[PDB]
Amino acid sequence: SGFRKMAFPSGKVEGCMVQVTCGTTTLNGLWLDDVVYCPRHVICTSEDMLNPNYEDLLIRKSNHNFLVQAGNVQLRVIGHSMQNCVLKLKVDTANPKTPKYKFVRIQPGQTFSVLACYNGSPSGVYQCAMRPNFTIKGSFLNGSCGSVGFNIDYDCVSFCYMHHMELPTGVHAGTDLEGNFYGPFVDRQTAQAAGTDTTITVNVLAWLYAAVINGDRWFLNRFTTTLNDFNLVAMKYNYEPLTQDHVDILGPLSAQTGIAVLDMCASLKELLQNGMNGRTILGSALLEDEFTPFDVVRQCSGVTF
Amino acid sequence: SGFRKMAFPSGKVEGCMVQVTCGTTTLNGLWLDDVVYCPRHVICPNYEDLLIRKSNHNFLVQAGNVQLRVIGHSMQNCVLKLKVDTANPKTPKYKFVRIQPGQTFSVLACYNGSPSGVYQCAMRPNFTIKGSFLNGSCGSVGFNIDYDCVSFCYMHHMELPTGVHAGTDLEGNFYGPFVDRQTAQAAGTDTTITVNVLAWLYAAVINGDRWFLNRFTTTLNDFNLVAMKYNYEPLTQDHVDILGPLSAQTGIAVLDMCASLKELLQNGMNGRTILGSALLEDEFTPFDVVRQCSGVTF
Ligand SMILES: CNC(=O)c1ccc2c(NC(=O)Cc3cccc(Cl)c3)cncc2c1
Ligand SMILES: CNC(=O)c1ccc2c(NC(=O)Cc3cccc(Cl)c3)cncc2c1
Ligand SMILES: [Cl-]
Fold this sequence. Notes:
By secondary structure, the first copy, chain A, is an alpha+beta fold. Chain A has helices spanning 11-14, 54-59, 201-213, 227-236, 244-249, 251-257, 261-274, 293-299, and strands at residues 17-22, 25-32, 35-39, 66-70, 73-75, 77-83, 86-91, 100-103, 111-118, 121-129, 148-153, 156-166, 172-175.
């Protein structure tokens, strides 16, 4: 019993964190095999950020301009290349602590663990989700750039995010491990703002199924809804449209609890209309959207209370 | 910016988790040097009588894909200490520490010696922890990190009828009035950790959330008279002293922040949130707030 926001054990990722210095800038790198991956803005000054020509700044750099530090050991850089918004530093030593890994690009709604680092040293781990507006509501300070997001399924680390910047509203933006940004963001100091954010509906529903599995059913009702009628009400509360794919994905949770997806949709409609009336669901007074249907199956028991 | 419930990196602890089997029971062990620590209920009650009938080979210890050979065994309170033939090469710098209610820690939840997740939680005033555990999680550990030293503070033993969790320190002494057997045991009435709610209000002010601030102050006595009515733990002068650095950074005196909490307790949030929460959060200590808003690394 119990339902917590749970992160993956960070050990396999801690063994890959290094410190990258270029001139006066210092941020984090991910050392996998003989390559260190880090945000390409490490080659920039604060001035360059207004309109940076990265190709021009990079052509003026040599290998010895990049200082890479793994614990108390200096790594020798033997090559460098740029792939989209990530700088790839070829080093002389392969990381002996390199785990089994894949680079994966996630979709909004997907969750992941973040290992927040400063100066190549990991300071904490937390769970978060890729928001519908492609931002992440993380907890980051200056020097955290290059911190990574990941999932560990079986013995393989799936790297999905690298931290690049903080937006004016305090939310964060970054890239996949191939340097492609999530969202309409650029590694440029420009007037770019996060779009209006929405609630991840399929995740709220999964979290309601988790509450039913943990013995709480106060929010259920005798009503059902059409998928179209649910979406007309959901849009009014800034909820993401629920698609037929989302309904299909919720199938196993519906089977385990005996509550059809459109029947659970009718409870969500009522929760949006009435609020919680002094009650909580899984110790929360708000509707939680940072647990996927897969996270619920992973964490919760296979037998309903 | 951003405020998350953050756990310590679990790497130093993952390298210590092993699987312990005794007959038909399977749970987790903590392998430090040549000793494996695990709940004594793995032998399940007169524990000395059940233990005297056991031999070393009755305990199967598995570290990854390698079998460890048990060469001795002894009991210390509610923890079983299995002397093994191999010292753990991944043993970090560590201490065994007993925490106080209100203090927080990271939990590395394990099943069959394999770590599955990490989360942050607090020792409640009623000595229970609101964790997330399933069958096979016994022996999962709680910890903090100070520089490079892992401070082990909790070992999971059982789940109570309300879904909350109970366990011991690493010397086998339970937190709370609990015993390790199948009997009628209930968690006492819980209270809100007041010093932690205040720290979380200071964290909100640091992150630019000040709607709950007012021009008023309160005496420590008047605050405690109101706090006792809402099932809040009494705020002591020590708690006020501990909140000193957060008061200095924000310019808001502790008894001034207490007047804001008094207003939230009497009138609610009125459709508003603090750090994305519609409830007052008590599982962040004053030190956790300072650490998350400073960038302390391990
Ligand atoms: C209290 N928080 C802060 O003051 C703060 C300051 C800075 C933070 C930060 N840094 C940047 O954004 C660097 C940069 C500037 C312009 C463009 C790009 Cl692509 C990168 C990252 N993550 C978090 C931060 C947090
Ligand atoms: C789906 N999970 C469960 O049903 C479940 C079952 C059991 C859980 C558990 N184990 C126990 O309490 C076993 C025990 C019984 C009597 C005395 C003692 Cl000291 C220990 C711990 N933590 C979580 C659990 C969760
Ligand atoms: Cl995805």
